[PDB]
């Protein structure tokens, strides 16, 4: 069964304070096909965790400049307003299959779009709560000492080892990945 | 069997001369782990290829700058010396895992380190079909209006789709995958 | 993720051409005793994040030393004119800010002296072209900068180091998020 | 265990009538990131101590000349006023960053700004109270016979030595240098 190395590995140096299971993402890779299937064994993570045990994700510039700055504020928005599982897919889509976010402006665009306020955005934006956000998501990036996206880290302690994991089935693969996170969040 | 819309698309303009099977990849994303997934599927997609059909693969930059042209510029100098199998393993790991590859020089480094005489690589590296090839790389992905990596095309006419094959299992879908580009190779 | 304009590092609005490549400022008189020692230390773990290549200049600044701080600048263009950094900053250090036993040029040559090198080079030294031409160099060095305070650091003559930019927190994360900066920007 | 020469160092003349725990600063140094450092700690230390411990700050002119001189007196106003949290970080960015403090009535600005009428100022400047604070700010340097700034003094017999404590994160050293200052306090 378990054992690190294999499902999953334990990091050299904990980071303390970090929410409880931890995601990152990028809206800027992977692609299309890769992107959506990260999306669905995300999904399965989420359902099948104890009890009111939360998962969080955060998002990470590689290689974006100013408009994936911009994307990790307005994903700092999103959580701010509880607006997630509404914006995810306009921006993700946007960014990459019609690409038509390329500035700041078509960001907020998008939560116009999405139903949220054009008003509450913008204090959204400017927001303490939001700049605060922002630090967060950047500061846990550099802890984790992140690599690469997709990635998952659990208690700021372990982090998922998908290749140590049977993929030749595709929801053995799915729920052996979301039986790890819930057997790490009780470690 | 087959269907328009389900494990392939047709294209609207069609892109004349184009190679048998083109793949397009790059060397910044998916990330190493799906990078590498995606690189033992197309390895085992070729393997299960048709007698004389080619499997072509062009380098894309989306968001890498100067470097990630660079890197094109170098797969079409491995292109060209038909060393593809030789660099694209530590190009890969270059760029993305030990990140040692920041300059043009870097590249050289790795096709020398591979065996390719340097004064071989900088005559390639200035030569006209080098810098037909990367004009080639650059217009082929502007012709099919490329959007994400990895994808495939079959004799610039229809466009692979993963998410419209059984991907439940990894054996149903190589095949699934190979055999369709079979079908298509035969239009 | 990482980098950021204004954060680990600020941009000047004009780049000081010739610059040496990585270029920090000092002061014999600020700051004090353990801070002193601090930045001493945070500036060597920082050297010892880069190539032999990746060259760490020192310029030292007078901010309100009158003459003796403008003696000191001249013995530091000395020392860098003979390359004798590393033999003088400590005992020119304690001898300004600890002991106070430096008060004069002459207290100056004696440090110097003391240190290993001959008073004749020393004064050799003093009196050259190329003293006084780093005099001006470090005087103007810090006006194109437009420095306020020190210690400071400079890549290229272009972007600034910013620790406020950095974690703070731990040592050890501050000093690696600061070393890798300068090398990122050392390519920039 | 609290040892001499290591976390505090004891003068060799003791100087009857010292505050309980004087810190000295100056507004010249340290400079800007590590000034704002010196205040964060001595801010939190405060915090930390006992509710008998009082905590003193004198300024000091470190070859300030005029402006200098105009900054202690200006120190004494805000310490007969109760105003030293007021202006303390006003006072250090006109000096340091914005360098709009140059001249004694850019200090009077700093003060009405934050608050204090001009008359109230004006009155505080010219008061003997003021005057005896001058005096005593710079007889308390001399007696201690102060040789750099920060330092901090506890029953003007102990000087709190930075370099004996762990340094290596701030939430333990602002615990330390807390729990030495309330060790000295007590003997």
Same mark, same amino acid.
């Given at each position: 069964q378990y054992e690190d190395g294999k499902q999953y590995t334990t990091l050299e140096k904990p980071v303390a304070g970090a929410p409880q299971v931890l995601e990152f993402f990028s809206?800027?890779?992977?692609?299309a096909y890769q992107f959506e299937e990260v999306l669905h064994i995300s999904d399965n993570v989420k359902k099948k965790l104890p009890e009111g045990v939360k998962m969080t994700k955060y998002h990470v510039n590689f290689m974006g400049g100013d408009l994936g700055k911009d994307l990790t504020q307005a994903w700092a928005v999103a959580m701010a307003l509880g607006v997630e599982d509404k914006v995810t897919v306009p921006l993700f889509e946007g960014v990459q299959?019609?690409?038509?976010?390329? /500035?700041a402006s078509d960001i907020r665009d998008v939560f116009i779009n999405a139903g949220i306020k054009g008003e509450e955005y913008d204090a959204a934006w400017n927001s303490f709560v939001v700049k605060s956000l922002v630090a967060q998501q950047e500061k846990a990036a550099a802890d984790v000492q992140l690599r690469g996206v997709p990635a998952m880290f659990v208690n700021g302690k372990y982090q998922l080892n998908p290749?140590?994991?049977?993929? /030749?089935n595709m929801d053995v693969f799915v729920q052996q990945y979301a039986d790890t996170v819930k057997y790490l969040s009780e470690k």
């Open positions: 809206f800027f890779c992977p692609h299959k019609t690409q038509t976010i390329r /500035s290749q140590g994991m049977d993929t /030749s």
